[PDB]
Design a protein around this ligand. Structure first.
Ligand SMILES: O=c1ccn([C@@H]2O[C@H](COP(=O)(O)OP(=O)(O)O)[C@@H](O)[C@H]2O)c(=O)[nH]1
Ligand SMILES: COC(=O)CCCCCCCCO[C@@H]1O[C@H](CO)[C@H](O)[C@H](O)[C@H]1O
Ligand SMILES: [Cl-]
Ligand SMILES: [Cl-]
Ligand SMILES: [Hg+2]
Ligand SMILES: [Hg+2]
Ligand SMILES: [Hg+2]
Ligand SMILES: [Hg+2]
Ligand SMILES: [Hg+2]
Ligand SMILES: [Mn+2]
Length: 263
């Protein structure tokens, strides 16, 4: 049950004025593609807060990667789901190496040394790479049953150029005439149920490939793309959500660089 939104004063949307004229803002299966300018964050924040939404953010930090945790968490505190309940899940082989980062109210962190727990603790799961930093707003506009993010190096490429797994012997196989977009393995998420369905599917597919003596060209990312091709995401995030300014600069089409690679 969703309660009514309170009175709000904001610019009236204009039916005869496109949001963005330079980019596709909706997929052929009617899923919004999230770009700056397409959403009113005040309306969205209201909608999700009225649901007392809790977002889980998962990251793996093994070996030398534990060094990226401090900046990742500090910047997440400044830009990730601020105002909402957040639960960080850090999977690491070095529990004692996790930095002591100060968190805002309503936010907590759990260290898991290297399920049904996520189903009882959070509403949405966001899975990202740790060697990154938030530089701008990453909020509830991304929440939906299942979302993928456009790879910053292939958003303008034709499907034929996509680095999908091309060997029929692999479960991640996608022919040259198939494919919507090339999604990043480093930033995906959705409801706990949908995320677990995706990871369960990829885990099984990778096991089959392993038994068959084959390894997808881009590992988990290849399987993720196969899954999202066959199970269309309900929202697609623009490259604003995972960029590398060092390797790609700051194009005009990107009004904001929200989450980026650490040099
Ligand atoms: O030895 C590793 C390799 C990868 N990772 C995690 O997996 C992510 C993605 O792999 P990686 O960053 O090495 O490649 P990229 O995805 O940067 O090409 C890393 O950012 C970490 O979050 C890790 O913890 N230990
Ligand atoms: C995930 O890659 C990045 O965040 C940096 C992208 C920089 C611009 C060039 C993008 C294409 C080459 O990057 C590599 O692409 C392959 C798939 O073809 C994998 O996604 C690699 O992780 C990525 O580094
Ligand atoms: Cl993860
Ligand atoms: Cl991840
Ligand atoms: Hg708009
Ligand atoms: Hg995850
Ligand atoms: Hg998969
Ligand atoms: Hg997998
Ligand atoms: Hg996957
Ligand atoms: Mn990475």
């Amino acid at each position: 049950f969703m309660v009514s939104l309170p009175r709000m004063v904001y610019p009236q949307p204009k039916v005869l004025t496109p949001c963005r004229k330079d980019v596709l803002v909706v997929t052929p299966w009617l899923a919004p593609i999230v770009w700056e300018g397409t959403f009113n964050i005040d309306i969205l924040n209201e909608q999700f807060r009225l649901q007392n939404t809790t977002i889980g953010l998962t990251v793996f930090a093994i070996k030398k990667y534990v060094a990226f945790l401090k900046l990742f968490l500090e910047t997440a505190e400044k830009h990730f789901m601020v105002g909402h309940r957040v639960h960080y899940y850090v999977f690491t082989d070095q529990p004692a190496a996790v930095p002591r980062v100060t968190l805002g109210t309503g936010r907590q962190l759990s260290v898991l040394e290297v399920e049904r727990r996520f189903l009882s603790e959070v509403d949405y799961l966001v899975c990202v790479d740790v060697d990154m930093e938030f530089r701008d707003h990453v909020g509830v506009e991304i929440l939906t049953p299942l979302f993928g993010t456009l790879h910053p190096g292939f958003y303008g490429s034709s499907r034929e150029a996509f680095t999908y797994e091309r060997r029929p012997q692999s479960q991640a196989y996608i022919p040259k005439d198939e494919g919507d977009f090339y999604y990043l393995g480093g930033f995906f998420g959705g409801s706990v149920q949908e995320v677990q369905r995706l990871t369960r599917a990829c885990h099984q597919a990778m096991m089959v490939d392993q038994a068959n003596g084959i390894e997808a060209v881009w590992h988990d990312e290849s399987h993720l793309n196969k899954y999202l091709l066959r199970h269309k995401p309900t929202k697609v995030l623009s490259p604003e959500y995972l960029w590398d300014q060092q390797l790609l600069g700051w194009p005009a089409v990107l009004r904001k660089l929200r989450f980026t690679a650490v040099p």
